[PDB]
C-alpha cells in the first residue's frame, strides 16, 4: 500500500550561480517554470568579500 503521488514527487535542493550585477539597479533572478518553490537562499559573493 503506497502513496503513489507522494513517491512520484521529488523534493529537490538544486543550486546555481547568477552573474551580471551593476550598482543601483534591480538584478532579477527568475524562478523557473512548473516548480513548487519552498525556500530561496541568496549568497552575495561580492568578489571574495562578504
Amino acid at each position: 500500500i503506497l502513496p503513489l503521488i507522494d513517491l512520484s514527487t521529488l523534493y529537490n535542493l538544486e543550486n546555481s550561480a547568477q552573474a551580471g550585477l551593476t550598482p543601483n539597479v534591480d538584478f532579477v533572478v527568475q524562478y523557473a517554470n512548473l516548480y513548487r518553490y519552498l525556500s530561496t537562499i541568496a549568497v552575495f559573493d561580492n568578489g571574495g568579500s562578504f
Binding site: 503506497l2 512520484s8 517554470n33 512548473l34
Partner: protein, 84 residues
C-alpha cells in the same frame, strides 16, 4: 434668393473674352497594355511562424513501474493470553 432692386436693376450676362475653346477640352489619355512582371515564386521564407502558440506550459508525465515486491520480516505481536 436675392431681391430685385427696382430702382437699379441689371440684365443678364453679356459676352466677354474667352479662354481659346480647344484649350479647355482634354485628350482622352490612351492606355497601353501592361503586365505584372516576372515569374512569381510559390512560397516565401517567412520571418515568423504561421501557426498557433501556447500561453502557458503544462506539465507532462510518463508512467514508470516500481520493481519486484519482496517479503518482509515483521516484528510479531505477543499472544493474547488475557493481557492486552
Amino acid at each position: 434668393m436675392a431681391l430685385i432692386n427696382p430702382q437699379f436693376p441689371y440684365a443678364g450676362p453679356v459676352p466677354i473674352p474667352g479662354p481659346a475653346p480647344t484649350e479647355t477640352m482634354p485628350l482622352l489619355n490612351y492606355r497601353v497594355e501592361g503586365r505584372i512582371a516576372g515569374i512569381q515564386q510559390a512560397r516565401q521564407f517567412m520571418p515568423f511562424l504561421q501557426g498557433p502558440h501556447r500561453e502557458v506550459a503544462e506539465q507532462t508525465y510518463y508512467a514508470i513501474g516500481t520493481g519486484i515486491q519482496m517479503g518482509q520480516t515483521f516484528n510479531q505481536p505477543l499472544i493474547n493470553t488475557q493481557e492486552g
